């Protein structure tokens, strides 16, 4: 029975007649009357046909099927020692939770606590862990939910699940989802420290350091860090008033003591004469660091960590394949500008080639306002820090790019003419033969975080907001080898439709692309040996089928695949394998902002 419904509903119009007959109430009654002794094999079957009924569902259906939300949650709370059904139950919780009124019933009945509990139990299953994250990310928009997640220690999950190393075989959808869900939950200084208190700083630092050749992970990590720095950094002005107050304590103290030292000597109770003049009293350096330094110090970041972060940021921003990934360049320059403006990591910036990073951005994106602010803040702050490192970055290529870029800036609207004047002041002080310390004395050396767009959702219009080169490359496509379930290594050519809505592909020697998957239904794209057709091609060909060459693309069910289409594949290189996963990440991401 269950399988008939699933093959019938495979033709999407057939869902409406199932709803006319009341399928949603049948499922509820079936789910709410299960006994834990009910075989999990058929619970698995039923739930897989239920996610098929809500898979290609938008709005009105999510409201009627909502009557199954709570019944599903009951089965998820029941002691399910397996993970096969558990996935499906959270998958239809996530689908149902697309609709706001369900996500609210889900929070109002313990879903947050149940989900966090289930994640911990089964966090060895990244698929269930990834769906748990997605469920939670949704709750970042529900009222009281951020605080319900804090009470249940959600950051233990978010800190633990974004682990990466140097081999480039991360579980991408988990690391990216984790970083994004973190950025979305951190919306307050308090919340930022709780993430720090859970281990977030060390986690984030290592992510950045290992993602020189993982742009998608780099981008989301730097966005998480930029927001932490934003909520925990007071103005340069408030902190300066704090430092002078501290110095006024010490001065007033060193004077009281110097006056007892004079009285005691003149009175004859001590023998040491006091000094002709006081010694300048230095404040306790720990009290002075707390007053003086920005949110980086309040969170426990130290010189060696920052030097390594900014070295990686600079390395990543200068990979040739990254020069025109503006969203990534913006956040790289943002961290470089933040630490430059707070006089940290300056030597790492200049030593890791900040100059060539600034020169290319101003050349490949001449005129653009955000990169020009951040870039100018870097130039200004570096010029005021050291006349020697400033000279290192002040070069013909940089000034020629600065001149050309300052002139290409907008001038129509009044807000734009203000921005151009600030960059213009940087170009002027550079060209002046007067000392940099005086030339740049009246230019801005403090970061406005809005120019980093760290919290700005991309793709407001959808897939056709993708950068042109990503669209051109998605359409370009590529060739791979697919290790079909029960067949030999077969050639495969893929390609995005002109539509950018369809993952087309031909196989073997075919040249018409008759196999098609709508990009929104591509559930996951995973790196490594995650399919038996790849684990078995490894034992039989270990050097050509290694984890750095392989991947698998999971999609919607099909007449061939009753449980879901899966394409285990292998590339000629890791760079080809990583590039594939990289486009797929942006493509699917941008598709979620359609209609």
From TrEMBL:
In this entry, which stretches build a coiled coil?
none
Q: Which domain of life is it from?
A: Eukaryota
Protein name according to UniProt: Putative anonymous antigen-1
Please specify the portion of the entire protein covered by the chain, as first and last position out of its full length. Answer: 2045 to 2639 of 2639
């Amino acid at each position: 029975v269950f399988k008939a419904i699933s093959n019938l509903s495979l033709y999407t119009p057939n869902i409406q007649p199932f709803l006319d007959a009341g399928i949603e109430n049948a499922y509820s009654t079936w789910l709410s009357n299960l006994s834990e002794t009910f075989p999990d094999a058929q619970l698995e079957t039923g739930c897989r046909t239920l996610v098929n009924l809500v898979m290609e569902n938008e709005e009105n259906n999510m409201r009627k099927f909502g009557v199954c939300l709570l019944p599903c949650m009951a089965v998820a709370k029941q002691g399910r020692t397996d993970t096969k059904a558990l996935l499906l139950l959270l998958d239809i919780e996530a689908s149902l939770c697309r609709l706001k009124e369900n996500a609210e019933a889900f929070a109002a009945n313990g879903g947050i606590e149940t989900t966090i509990r289930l994640i911990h139990q089964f966090d060895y299953d990244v698929g269930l862990l990834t769906l748990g994250i997605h469920l939670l990310g949704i709750q970042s928009a529900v009222k009281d939910s951020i605080q319900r997640m804090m009470d249940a220690d959600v950051f233990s999950i978010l800190v633990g699940c974004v682990e990466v190393d140097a081999e480039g075989n991360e579980v991408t959808d988990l690391v990216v989802g984790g970083l994004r869900c973190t950025r979305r939950i951190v919306r307050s200084e308090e919340l930022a420290f709780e993430y720090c208190n859970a281990g977030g700083i060390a986690t984030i630092a290592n992510v950045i350091c290992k993602s020189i050749n993982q742009p998608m992970v780099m981008l989301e990590a730097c966005r998480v860090l930029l927001g932490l720095l934003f909520y925990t950094t007071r103005s340069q002005a408030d902190r300066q008033a704090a430092v002078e107050a501290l110095h006024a304590q010490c001065q007033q103290r060193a004077e009281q003591m110097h006056a007892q030292a004079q009285a005691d000597y003149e009175a004859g109770v001590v023998s040491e004469p006091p000094p002709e003049e006081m010694e300048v009293p230095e404040p306790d350096p720990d009290e002075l660091a707390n007053a003086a330094y920005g949110g980086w110090y309040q969170m426990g970041m130290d010189e060696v960590m920052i030097d390594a972060i900014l070295q990686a940021v600079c390395a990543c921003a200068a990979v040739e394949a990254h020069a025109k990934q503006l969203r990534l360049q913006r956040v790289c320059l943002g961290l470089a500008a933040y630490f430059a403006s707070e006089q940290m990591g300056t030597s790492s910036l200049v030593g890791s080639g900040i100059e060539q990073v600034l020169t290319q951005i101003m050349t490949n994106f001449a005129g653009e306002g955000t990169t020009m602010q951040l870039s100018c803040v870097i130039i200004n702050s570096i010029a005021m820090t050291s006349g020697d490192m400033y000279e290192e970055i002040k070069t013909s290529a940089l000034l020629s790019a600065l001149k050309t870029s300052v002139g290409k800036m907008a001038t129509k609207k009044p807000e734009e003419k203000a921005l151009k004047e600030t960059c213009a002041a940087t170009l002027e002080a550079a060209s002046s033969g007067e000392d940099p310390f005086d030339a740049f004395s009246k230019t801005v050396t403090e970061l406005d975080f809005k120019f980093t767009e760290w919290n700005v959702d991309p793709y407001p219009n959808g897939v056709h907001d993708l950068p042109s080169n990503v669209k051109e490359a998605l359409r370009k496509g590529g060739k791979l080898k697919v290790f079909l379930p029960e067949k030999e290594k077969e050639e495969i050519r893929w390609r995005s439709s002109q539509d950018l809505n369809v993952f087309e592909w031909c196989m073997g020697n075919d040249q018409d692309y008759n196999n098609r998957i709508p990009i929104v239904r591509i559930r996951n794209v995973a790196k490594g040996l995650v399919h038996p057709a790849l684990k078995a091609a490894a034992k039989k060909e270990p050097r050509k089928v290694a984890a750095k060459f392989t991947m698998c693309l999971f999609g919607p069910p099909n007449d061939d695949f009753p449980e879901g289409v899966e394409l285990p594949m292998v590339a000629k290189s890791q760079k080809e394998r990583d590039a594939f996963v990289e486009m797929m990440v942006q493509w699917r991401d941008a598709a979620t902002y359609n209609f």
